[PDB]
Structure formats: structure tokens, C-alpha cells
Design a protein. Structure first.
Length: 193
């Protein structure tokens, strides 16, 4: 049931985008990303390496989600959790459909921030998640304070629904319907985003 690895060219940014499954060999790198100042407030995983290892192992053995590393021209610089809403905490907050999916993400290295690279990456992984035939909706619940990500999500087709009082944050529940997404993905690829 896991999201498959993939590699695509993006002609807009003129880069190779590649996504692979996370493994335990990634623990030091991922641990470093979790200690970045732009990540800490939203992920809260600035914890000792020993603990991060135990957490990563548990998530890698979790069947409702797929952990991936996203890379630009082979350089790993983003972390992704792709999941089924039905088996996730967010299912409790809205009348989800059976095959709805969700996405969590971060850009790790500072050297990959501020360059608009989240768009081609997010559009690519969304496209591959939407190839599940019965999935019509993908949801996201960014912290309500993460104005930049709320903006990025809106630009990719996500519509805000309502705040969600989650254990770790007040999120903004947002839904992206496939027909809207394909139009935005096509706008992107046709240089009219
Ligand atoms: Cl391609
Ligand atoms: Cl392309
Ligand atoms: Cl967030």
C-alpha cells in the first residue's frame, strides 16, 4: 500500500526530482533536519539522536504511511510523510472518504529554502499520490501560523476548510480535489501557474 519511489524531470525549474523511501541509514541526516530552526516549531522533533532513531524506526514500520526523501539533482533536501486519512488522527475532524490521503512535508537544508523549489516537489508527489484510482482528495493540516505553507498549498489547489485542534497544534485543514489539482499541475507545466 506504500507510495512508490519515482523520478521526474521538471522543465519549469530545469531539475531532476527524485523521491525514494526513507531507510534507517537516513537517521543522521533526518535528525539534522529536525534540528533546523525553520522546522522545529512545526515538527517538534529536535530530540536526541537515540530517541529520533526509535521514532524513525517506529514510523518506518507503520503501515498507514510512506516516508520519503525528495532530492533535486540527486541532493536530498526534503522529507515527506504520505498517509491514508482513514488510519490517521485527521480522520476525526471531517467526513473523510475511504481513500482520502494526506501529506506532511519539510525542506531540511537552508540552502534549499527561498528558491520556489517546494512547488515542483509538492506538485510531483501530489501527482503520484493521485494516481491511486479511488483517491479523489488529498488533505493537509499545516500549523495555522505557517502562512508560507498555507499559501503554497493554496497555489497548488488546496482549499481551506477550518481550523483543527490537534494534540500538537492548531492546524488549518485544507483539501485538494483531484480535478482542481490536475488543472494547477497543467498550469505549472504550461508555464501559466
Ligand atoms: Cl519526467
Ligand atoms: Cl516537466
Ligand atoms: Cl506546518
Amino acid at each position: 500500500d506504500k507510495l512508490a519511489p519515482f523520478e521526474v524531470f521538471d522543465h519549469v525549474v530545469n531539475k531532476k526530482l527524485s523521491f525514494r523511501h526513507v531507510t534507517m541509514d537516513d537517521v543522521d541526516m533526518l535528525h539534522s533536519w529536525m534540528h533546523e530552526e525553520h522546522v522545529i516549531p512545526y515538527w517538534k522533533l529536535n530530540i536526541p539522536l537515540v530517541d529520533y532513531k526509535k521514532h524513525l524506526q517506529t514510523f518506518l514500520n507503520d503501515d498507514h504511511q510512506t516516508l520519503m526523501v525528495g532530492a533535486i539533482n540527486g541532493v536530498p533536501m526534503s522529507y515527506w510523510e504520505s498517509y491514508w486519512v482513514k488510519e490517521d488522527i485527521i480522520a476525526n475532524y471531517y467526513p473523510f472518504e475511504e481513500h482520502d490521503q494526506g501529506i506532511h512535508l519539510l525542506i531540511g537544508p537552508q540552502e534549499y529554502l527561498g528558491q520556489g523549489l517546494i512547488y515542483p516537489l509538492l506538485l510531483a508527489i501530489m501527482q503520484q499520490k493521485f494516481q491511486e484510482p479511488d483517491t479523489n482528495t488529498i488533505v493537509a493540516e499545516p500549523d495555522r501560523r505557517n502562512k508560507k505553507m498555507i499559501h503554497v498549498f493554496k497555489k497548488c489547489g488546496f482549499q481551506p476548510v477550518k481550523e483543527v485542534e490537534l494534540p500538537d497544534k492548531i492546524g488549518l485543514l485544507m483539501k485538494c480535489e483531484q480535478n482542481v489539482f490536475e488543472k494547477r499541475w497543467s498550469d505549472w507545466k504550461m508555464n501559466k501557474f
